Design a protein around this ligand. Structure first.
Ligand SMILES: Cc1cc2nc3c(=O)[nH]c(=O)nc-3n(C[C@H](O)[C@H](O)[C@H](O)COP(=O)(O)OP(=O)(O)OC[C@H]3O[C@@H](n4cnc5c(N)ncnc54)[C@H](O)[C@@H]3O)c2cc1C
Length: 147
């Protein structure tokens, strides 16, 4: 996984999201003080390319343990979840809903059981919205996590 050398336009993307003409889920106002991440949809397995301070702190994982990985790792108390595996602590329907929404560039909002680095179980009120890069086409996905 590689990252944009100059960094990501997180604030620009936040504004883009709040300005979206056809919102499908209720986000309301959000900013960089929250736990959020940006994944690259044009790279293998939609890797995380940006994680806010709040996300790292809320989950207990460091930047080096988050960047370049699919966020599904939060689905196991040991931070290890293989793609297509049948999770034993997370509802399959919820996981499937997330997968199809991403594949369709459709907004989605769910409550999913996740685990912190120390293994603590928590419910993640998660919202994901597709983001267009400078080309005007969808390239990234911004996720908003809330314990
Ligand atoms: C920006 C962003 C932020 C994210 N943040 C989080 C986060 O904070 N926490 C989190 O947990 N995830 C998060 N995700 C989601 C995660 O990265 C994956 O997208 C999610 O787990 C679903 O995709 P998958 O690849 O894991 O699917 P898969 O590994 O393919 O798993 C799908 C599961 O659903 C079941 N299933 C599939 N199809 C069907 C069907 N037709 N009928 C019945 N069952 C079916 C299967 O049994 C399977 O185990 C985020 C994603 C993005 C893009």
């Amino acid at each position: 996984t590689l990252y944009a050398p100059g960094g990501y336009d997180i604030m620009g993307y936040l504004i883009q999201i709040m300005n979206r003409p056809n919102p499908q889920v209720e986000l309301g106002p959000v900013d960089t003080s929250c736990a959020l991440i940006l994944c690259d949809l044009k790279q293998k397995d939609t890797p995380i390319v940006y994680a806010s301070e709040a996300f790292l702190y809320m989950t207990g994982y460091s930047n080096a343990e988050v960047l370049g990985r699919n966020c599904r790792f939060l689905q196991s108390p040991d931070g290890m979840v293989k793609p297509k595996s049948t999770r034993k602590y997370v509802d399959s329907n919820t996981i499937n809903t997330m997968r199809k929404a991403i594949d369709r560039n459709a907004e989605v909002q769910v409550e999913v059981v996740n685990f912190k680095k120390n293994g603590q179980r928590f419910v993640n009120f998660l919202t994901m919205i597709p983001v267009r890069d400078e080309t005007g086409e969808y390239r990234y996905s911004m996720g908003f996590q809330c314990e």
